[PDB]
């Protein structure tokens, strides 16, 4: 069975080359259905500090079947208990029509101290 | 009737699927004419600090007739009198051919302490 959101998505972008998906509540993760075979451009806007100040490096997860072509990791250092902008971005190939994908934040290096105003935005570029 | 400026913009991107607009001086706001019916991806590169250090959250405005589909707010905390990167980004639907739109920075939470090197860049994706 397909969800209401999944059902809407296929029809919504049926005649489109670009598609946008984001999760209005929390914004740390994005789950969506690819309306067509595409390349995903995932942007994770994030603010935070490392555990007791210090280093923290973040990235985006690679769902099964996808290839993380490129990844621009987000980094922050010091400023304990104060969240600072540390956006991460990654590009994925191999997304398939009708398939559901889930992208999350991943810890690349160091430990998390606390997040603020995270927002993951997915841009899909239709193949052909 | 269409103005010379309106016509120039419309002819410039006549055979384009993507268009870019930004404001040369200041960079806090962008005013432009949509060359065709589109979806806008507004990115506001911003640096700043909250009033006397502390919390400050920024976003982008929603001009009349448009729908802010998604918004990734920018945030900063502490570091009084030192501007730190706090970019915000928002996606809009409902832009119409020949219509003029104006996007500005908006204060989502907290108070402003002072800005540095702001740059708003508009990406337009033509509707098929």
């Amino acid at each position: 069975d397909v969800s209401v959101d999944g059902d809407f998505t296929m029809k919504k972008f049926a005649d489109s080359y670009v598609a946008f998906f984001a999760n209005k509540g929390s914004g740390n993760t994005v789950t969506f259905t690819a309306p067509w075979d595409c390349t995903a451009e995932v942007e994770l806007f994030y603010h935070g500090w490392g555990y007791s100040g210090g280093e923290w490096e973040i990235g985006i997860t690679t769902p099964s079947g996808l290839t993380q072509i490129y990844e621009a990791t987000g980094y922050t250092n010091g400023h304990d208990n104060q969240a600072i902008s540390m956006p991460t971005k990654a590009i994925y190939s191999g997304l398939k029509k009708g398939l559901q994908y889930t992208f999350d934040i991943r810890d690349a290096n160091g430990r998390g101290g606390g997040p603020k105003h995270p927002m993951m935005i997915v841009k899909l570029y239709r193949n052909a | 009737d269409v103005s010379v400026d309106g016509d120039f913009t419309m002819k410039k991107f006549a055979d384009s699927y993507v268009a870019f607009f930004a404001n040369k001086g200041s960079g806090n706001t962008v005013t432009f004419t949509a060359p065709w019916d589109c979806t806008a991806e507004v990115e506001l590169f911003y640096h700043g600090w909250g009033y006397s250090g502390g919390e400050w959250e920024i976003g982008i405005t929603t001009p009349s007739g448009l729908t802010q589909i998604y918004e990734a707010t920018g945030y900063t905390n502490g570091h009084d009198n030192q501007a730190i990167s706090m970019p915000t980004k928002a996606i809009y639907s409902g832009l119409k051919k020949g219509l003029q739109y104006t996007f500005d920075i908006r204060d989502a939470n907290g108070r402003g302490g002072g800005p540095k090197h702001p740059m708003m860049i508009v990406k337009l994706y033509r509707n098929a």
Partner: nanobody
Amino acid sequence: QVQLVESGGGSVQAGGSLRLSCTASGFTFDDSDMGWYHQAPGNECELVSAIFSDGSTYYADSVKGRFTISRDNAKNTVYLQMNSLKPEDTAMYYCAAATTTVASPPVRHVCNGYWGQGTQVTVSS
């Protein structure tokens, strides 16, 4: 929580017209995609029509040119103007929302009263 309310359905003869209304609450309406599902007894829960955040519309091939979906973002309401009704249009009509703030239910749940209880449309020959 997310609340959907449908009204408008009733008994009518073929060729007639009905206007279904759906008022929403519990989520940012302007950013959401709204739709109408229907289920005739013995058939599956199927999307009749949908109006997206960007103003664009979808219509099922069976209702194309007869039905019109519209929205009044100010009133948080979606309308399905059903014209040139056929006996095949007889179904229980359910309103649906696609907002990223709430979890999206499987389509089958919509026609089981996941949100609203639905509005019955009955068309005679």
